[PDB]
Enzyme design. Structure first.
Site, mmCIF file in Angstrom:
data_model
loop_
_atom_site.group_PDB
_atom_site.id
_atom_site.type_symbol
_atom_site.label_atom_id
_atom_site.label_comp_id
_atom_site.label_asym_id
_atom_site.label_seq_id
_atom_site.Cartn_x
_atom_site.Cartn_y
_atom_site.Cartn_z
ATOM 1 N N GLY A 1 -55.674 33.687 -60.878
ATOM 2 C CA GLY A 1 -55.581 33.964 -59.447
ATOM 3 C C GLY A 1 -56.538 35.041 -58.966
ATOM 4 C CB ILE A 2 -55.961 37.829 -56.561
ATOM 5 C CG1 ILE A 2 -55.626 37.067 -55.275
ATOM 6 C CG2 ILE A 2 -56.677 39.108 -56.226
ATOM 7 C CD1 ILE A 2 -54.368 37.604 -54.628
ATOM 8 C CE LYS B 1 -54.576 25.070 -53.650
ATOM 9 N NZ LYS B 1 -53.822 25.209 -54.920
ATOM 10 C CB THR B 2 -52.876 32.762 -56.664
ATOM 11 O OG1 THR B 2 -51.538 33.001 -56.187
ATOM 12 C CG2 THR B 2 -53.905 33.545 -55.831
ATOM 13 C CD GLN C 1 -50.052 35.206 -35.201
ATOM 14 O OE1 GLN C 1 -50.564 34.617 -34.249
ATOM 15 N NE2 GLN C 1 -49.449 34.562 -36.192
ATOM 16 C CE1 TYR D 1 -45.286 40.664 -54.072
ATOM 17 C CE2 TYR D 1 -45.494 40.615 -51.670
ATOM 18 C CZ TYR D 1 -46.055 40.506 -52.927
ATOM 19 O OH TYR D 1 -47.389 40.233 -53.054
HETATM 20 N N1 LIG Z 1 -51.399 35.215 -53.712
HETATM 21 C C1 LIG Z 1 -51.124 35.804 -52.551
HETATM 22 O O1 LIG Z 1 -50.987 35.140 -51.535
HETATM 23 C C2 LIG Z 1 -51.043 37.315 -52.489
HETATM 24 C C3 LIG Z 1 -51.090 37.953 -51.255
HETATM 25 C C4 LIG Z 1 -51.031 39.348 -51.206
HETATM 26 C C5 LIG Z 1 -50.936 40.051 -52.396
HETATM 27 N N2 LIG Z 1 -50.883 39.429 -53.588
HETATM 28 C C6 LIG Z 1 -50.805 40.299 -54.774
HETATM 29 O O2 LIG Z 1 -51.973 40.038 -55.548
HETATM 30 C C7 LIG Z 1 -51.705 40.329 -56.919
HETATM 31 C C8 LIG Z 1 -52.098 39.119 -57.750
HETATM 32 O O3 LIG Z 1 -51.303 37.993 -57.363
HETATM 33 P P1 LIG Z 1 -51.711 36.453 -57.656
HETATM 34 O O4 LIG Z 1 -51.253 35.651 -56.450
HETATM 35 O O5 LIG Z 1 -53.125 36.284 -58.132
HETATM 36 O O6 LIG Z 1 -50.646 36.222 -58.836
HETATM 37 P P2 LIG Z 1 -50.670 35.082 -59.994
HETATM 38 O O7 LIG Z 1 -51.611 33.965 -59.661
HETATM 39 O O8 LIG Z 1 -49.209 34.958 -60.330
HETATM 40 O O9 LIG Z 1 -51.395 35.888 -61.193
HETATM 41 C C9 LIG Z 1 -50.814 37.111 -61.633
HETATM 42 C C10 LIG Z 1 -51.589 37.739 -62.779
HETATM 43 O O10 LIG Z 1 -50.825 38.887 -63.146
HETATM 44 C C11 LIG Z 1 -50.401 38.760 -64.513
HETATM 45 N N3 LIG Z 1 -49.082 39.384 -64.679
HETATM 46 C C12 LIG Z 1 -47.880 38.965 -64.249
HETATM 47 N N4 LIG Z 1 -46.914 39.838 -64.620
HETATM 48 C C13 LIG Z 1 -47.519 40.841 -65.296
HETATM 49 C C14 LIG Z 1 -47.108 42.086 -65.967
HETATM 50 N N5 LIG Z 1 -45.814 42.473 -66.002
HETATM 51 N N6 LIG Z 1 -48.076 42.814 -66.547
HETATM 52 C C15 LIG Z 1 -49.375 42.466 -66.546
HETATM 53 N N7 LIG Z 1 -49.830 41.344 -65.951
HETATM 54 C C16 LIG Z 1 -48.947 40.521 -65.343
HETATM 55 C C17 LIG Z 1 -50.427 37.273 -64.825
HETATM 56 O O11 LIG Z 1 -50.658 36.999 -66.211
HETATM 57 P P3 LIG Z 1 -49.442 36.607 -67.198
HETATM 58 O O12 LIG Z 1 -48.832 35.369 -66.573
HETATM 59 O O13 LIG Z 1 -50.241 36.386 -68.471
HETATM 60 O O14 LIG Z 1 -48.528 37.803 -67.257
HETATM 61 C C18 LIG Z 1 -51.609 36.827 -63.989
HETATM 62 O O15 LIG Z 1 -52.804 37.066 -64.733
HETATM 63 C C19 LIG Z 1 -50.217 40.656 -57.021
HETATM 64 O O16 LIG Z 1 -50.068 42.086 -56.953
HETATM 65 C C20 LIG Z 1 -49.654 40.089 -55.747
HETATM 66 O O17 LIG Z 1 -48.479 40.806 -55.345
HETATM 67 C C21 LIG Z 1 -50.945 38.085 -53.659
HETATM 68 O O1 LIG Z 2 -48.155 37.844 -48.307
HETATM 69 C C1 LIG Z 2 -47.910 37.340 -49.343
HETATM 70 C C2 LIG Z 2 -47.603 35.851 -49.596
HETATM 71 C C3 LIG Z 2 -47.527 34.756 -48.720
HETATM 72 C C4 LIG Z 2 -47.228 33.508 -49.252
HETATM 73 C C5 LIG Z 2 -46.997 33.345 -50.623
HETATM 74 C C6 LIG Z 2 -47.071 34.430 -51.487
HETATM 75 C C7 LIG Z 2 -47.375 35.686 -50.957
HETATM 76 C C8 LIG Z 2 -47.537 37.056 -51.632
HETATM 77 O O2 LIG Z 2 -47.425 37.291 -52.785
HETATM 78 N N1 LIG Z 2 -47.854 38.014 -50.613
HETATM 79 O O3 LIG Z 2 -48.052 39.364 -50.847
HETATM 80 MG MG LIG Z 3 -46.932 40.230 -36.478
#
Ligand SMILES: NC(=O)c1ccc[n+]([C@@H]2O[C@H](COP(=O)([O-])OP(=O)(O)OC[C@H]3O[C@@H](n4cnc5c(N)ncnc54)[C@H](OP(=O)(O)O)[C@@H]3O)[C@@H](O)[C@H]2O)c1
Ligand SMILES: O=C1c2ccccc2C(=O)N1O
Ligand SMILES: [Mg+2]
Ligand SMILES: NC(=O)c1ccc[n+]([C@@H]2O[C@H](COP(=O)([O-])OP(=O)(O)OC[C@H]3O[C@@H](n4cnc5c(N)ncnc54)[C@H](OP(=O)(O)O)[C@@H]3O)[C@@H](O)[C@H]2O)c1
Ligand SMILES: NC(=O)c1ccc[n+]([C@@H]2O[C@H](COP(=O)([O-])OP(=O)(O)OC[C@H]3O[C@@H](n4cnc5c(N)ncnc54)[C@H](OP(=O)(O)O)[C@@H]3O)[C@@H](O)[C@H]2O)c1
Ligand SMILES: NC(=O)c1ccc[n+]([C@@H]2O[C@H](COP(=O)([O-])OP(=O)(O)OC[C@H]3O[C@@H](n4cnc5c(N)ncnc54)[C@H](OP(=O)(O)O)[C@@H]3O)[C@@H](O)[C@H]2O)c1
Ligand SMILES: O=C1c2ccccc2C(=O)N1O
Ligand SMILES: O=C1c2ccccc2C(=O)N1O
Ligand SMILES: O=C1c2ccccc2C(=O)N1O
Ligand SMILES: [Mg+2]
Ligand SMILES: [Mg+2]
Lengths: 251, 251, 251, 253
Positions: free
Chosen positions: D19-20, D193-194, D253, D157
């Protein structure tokens, strides 16, 4: 105990909607009140609907009329004594995107919503500082000073200007020990003539995706936070934003 | 004339400082109040200073003790009736930067400042939803939930958590017509025992580069906004941040 | 490699300070650029100081001149093809509290700082929408669009207006699939002629109580965030505020 | 010609195997940085590293961000591989679809141990390890739009991302006041998208509604990688304590 005991308030645009309810609850809590508006019939009926000339009076004044502001303070002080409280509430809307906004609409809305709040805040500081009045300037912003709306571009500009200009004034008054506080109020959607005259506005803003409570507010919702802000209860609140919006900006 | 007529409030940490004044003015406005504290001796007379067992009572309770929260609500409810108002005020401070924070310090502060607010809010929603009580959860954040402080790292974390978690809860309650509102209060520096004990703090935070008004506030400043937030005057206010800080965050 | 390949940018107030550095780094990343300013002497050299007429040109235009904006786009598109990027950077300051601001000063500052950005944003949307250009409008606000300053009342008003008007524009462009993004940049203190001409300003804002880093920034600090916002790298960024301020607003 | 924007940098990216985080690792390498990525699953982690480059530029380290003792070994391991660490991306995080009302205390503590404690452990150790070395050090803490607005069904969260939002300001201020040459900023993605989003049934469709994301679609991991490149480079040498929002207009918004 009267929460606005001894207070003398100017409420611009106090003849309808939010401004009228601010006036109503201001008198209820012990304040002498001058309300303004542009239309004299509306204004005189509005004033008497709250009380007599011993507590509330109407003054015809366009908030964008700079010179009229000094007469407004003079008249208010003649009737009730030194002004302690200014509610810059007069405001208009324009339903246009930034793209579709005419320069005439732009200038007209800013003359009321921004210049009028500037005129009232600048004069209010001059006339109320250093008199031990517990003076309070309450500038009516909006949630549209916090978030954008795609069809309220000029309105957004004016409410964001009011938001931050008010902090400048608040800071200056505090640092100079003027005994004048300045805060902004940010209503969400409120059932008023402003909203009533916009067809389908209340149904639209009652959508959960807009207002999480699933309904719009009422003028008294804004009146009561203004009572808190006018009163000495809020003597430590300045430069701050008070949001009464049904959860609108929380999502 | 009783702005909190019929309301029943839990105020955690209501035996010293801000909490004590919230209870004091809650009872003045007609509410039955239960205050909590870890020290039974200090807490018992604190309850008596405001009134007797027909208005206010003490309950020994650490805010981070999850099981006690259930006993706290049961105790309050048979004493005074269904709880309508929860003021999550209990909190501690740690004078360390993030760099200098030990994990034991981190965990201890968050158990009170974050876990405790979570326990009261979660249980408060469960016990007060859907009863037509005009329920209100008032979560004490800080200006430190809005700006950082270089030597309050753990505290900043807890107060930013409280700030946004309260929005989640406000939104869910609104969208489900639970009739529970959730808002946060953000005091600037306030003369309390917590501040009295940090040596030189009141003078430090009275500097104009910190508090523009040149002084710090008093617990009554926070009490009067909580009165507004606990009353039906604020029935359109949810998920919002109410800042009473002498202008601290406005510059 | 060129992060702005194919882009065509108007940079208002591009002859000095921040705007000059924006133009510099825009041409460095492969954009074609028209800079504007009021003084032709300074402007022609400014353009020559960065490149030849093949990558950068100067146009004498006052950002408050509405009719001139249409000529400015026409001239830019004749030279380089369709405009992709508009940086509303021209702005001025007035060192007056709200209380002390003359109406002349008020109207003058807002004509440049607010009307100029409105004219540029409105025309930019009209001229760049629906053309697959990856268009980007970058509006120069300030930390003074976020916090107040006691001695920059009109300036605060203008920068707050720009902050929220830009969100309106961003939303409307997003909802209508215009392929135009709109974002605001919020510099803290930056060493420019604007600051240099203000006696004692750099020393004052380098105080740790003002800028925690203990110094002010430089024009390239703003140039690089503008490159990001102008590039397709930022294709999911709209309606947002990008703060580059040495920690000024973090405390 | 142009120049590697992260020349000489040495980055730890937690949760950098999907993902990210994976995209941040990828573009960090493209811009000249040496990277260590972490994650819990070694199978995923080792292929993640190989997909981006050799061990001359990127390596995987199995580490749970909630594991305090492992953070020390992680920095030690990164130093021995690549030299003094300059850049820490606290990106590992998890989610829990519960209102505050419906959150079990076990769900609460588990999410916060990762999302909050893990960012605390990485920020504190990043400061200690990078201060006063003139590296142009940058700590990038992954918050969310959910550290700026609430979501009725992500109560724990929200708490975690609001904490990250303000704790990072504390650290930014102390670092700046003490001349550590360490910047701290937060990044606030909207929906991206992750795997996290893909595994939540109906999430992408929900957050593509215009009432949620005005752009009418969710973003992609590179959207977050490119703002992280900016924040890690010396281009942002005047940015600290700030919030960088890449959300398709969600919070506007
Ligand atoms: N996707 C969104 O829409 C979105 C929006 C805003 C913020 N975020 C934030 O962006 C960050 C990345 O999210 P993502 O959407 O890319 O998530 P993701 O696709 O679920 O990937 C998460 C990554 O973190 C690792 N991980 C999970 N638990 C862990 C732990 N306890 N220690 C170390 N690594 C761990 C996973 O590897 P393993 O499975 O090998 O542990 C994976 O490499 C997170 O902080 C999330 O809160 C996401
Ligand atoms: O804002 C968001 C969001 C929207 C929709 C799905 C997952 C997520 C997430 O992990 N954050 O931080
Ligand atoms: Mg608003
Ligand atoms: N309603 C909402 O949902 C809402 C939400 C957030 C903020 N607000 C703000 O709250 C304030 C009150 O709005 P409202 O909804 O109560 O509006 P409203 O129902 O239209 O009331 C307008 C009041 O202002 C007066 N007024 C209009 N133009 C004026 C001028 N140039 N000078 C002096 N007075 C003038 C009107 O009287 P005349 O027509 O006789 O002059 C009337 O008394 C406005 O600033 C508005 O922007 C409203
Ligand atoms: N003072 C300020 O300037 C200021 C500014 C902004 C925000 N705040 C916040 O406002 C709240 C009140 O602060 P304050 O200055 O009034 O604090 P204070 O003077 O230290 O009083 C704290 C109260 O909380 C109680 N308490 C402490 N630990 C507790 C625990 N684990 N469980 C239950 N109760 C506990 C104390 O009683 P025992 O000693 O018996 O436990 C005391 O009654 C806190 O959340 C604080 O973070 C304070
Ligand atoms: N420097 C700071 O600390 C700082 C901080 C935050 C925000 N800002 C904002 O950044 C922007 C640029 O500021 P700066 O410090 O670079 O200013 P500066 O050093 O004074 O440069 C201003 C540039 O704008 C031009 N300009 C002035 N008035 C104009 C008009 N009416 N129409 C068109 N061009 C005009 C000037 O050229 P002519 O005089 O020849 O027209 C010059 O090229 C402004 O919007 C300012 O508010 C600056
Ligand atoms: O005037 C208005 C209005 C009308 C209808 C819905 C929402 C709003 C708002 O937020 N302001 O300020
Ligand atoms: O703990 C504190 C504190 C201590 C000293 C001055 C101000 C403050 C504040 O605003 N909070 O929350
Ligand atoms: O123009 C300016 C300026 C000049 C000098 C110090 C601070 C500032 C600021 O914040 N803006 O916007
Ligand atoms: Mg004008
Ligand atoms: Mg500040």
């Amino acid at each position: 105990t009267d929460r606005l005991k001894g207070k003398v308030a100017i409420v611009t645009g106090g003849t309808l909607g939010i401004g009228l309810a601010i006036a109503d609850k201001f008198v209820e809590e012990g304040a002498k009140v001058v309300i303004t508006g542009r239309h004299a019939d509306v204004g005189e009926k509005a004033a008497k609907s709250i009380g007599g000339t011993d507590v509330i009076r109407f003054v015809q004044h366009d908030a964008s009329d700079e010179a009229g502001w000094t007469k407004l303070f003079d008249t208010t002080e003649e009737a009730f004594g030194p002004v302690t409280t200014v509610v810059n509430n007069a405001g208009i809307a324009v339903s246009k995107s930034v793209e579709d906004t005419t320069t005439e609409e732009w200038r007209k809305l800013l003359s009321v919503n921004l210049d009028g709040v500037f005129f009232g805040t600048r004069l209010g500081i001059q006339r109320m500082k250093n008199k031990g009045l517990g003076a309070s300037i309450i500038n009516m912003s909006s949630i549209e000073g916090l978030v954008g709306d795609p069809t309220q571009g000029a309105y957004n500009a004016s409410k964001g200007a009011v938001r931050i200009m008010s902090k400048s004034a608040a800071l200056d008054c505090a640092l100079k020990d003027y005994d004048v506080r300045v805060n902004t109020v940010h209503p969400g959607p409120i059932k008023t003539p402003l909203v009533d005259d916009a067809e389908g506005a209340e149904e639209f803003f009652s959508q959960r995706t807009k207002t999480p409570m699933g309904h719009i507010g009422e003028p008294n919702d804004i009146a009561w936070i203004c009572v808190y802000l006018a009163s000495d209860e809020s003597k430590f609140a300045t430069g701050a934003e008070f949001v009464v919006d049904g959860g609108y900006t929380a999502q």
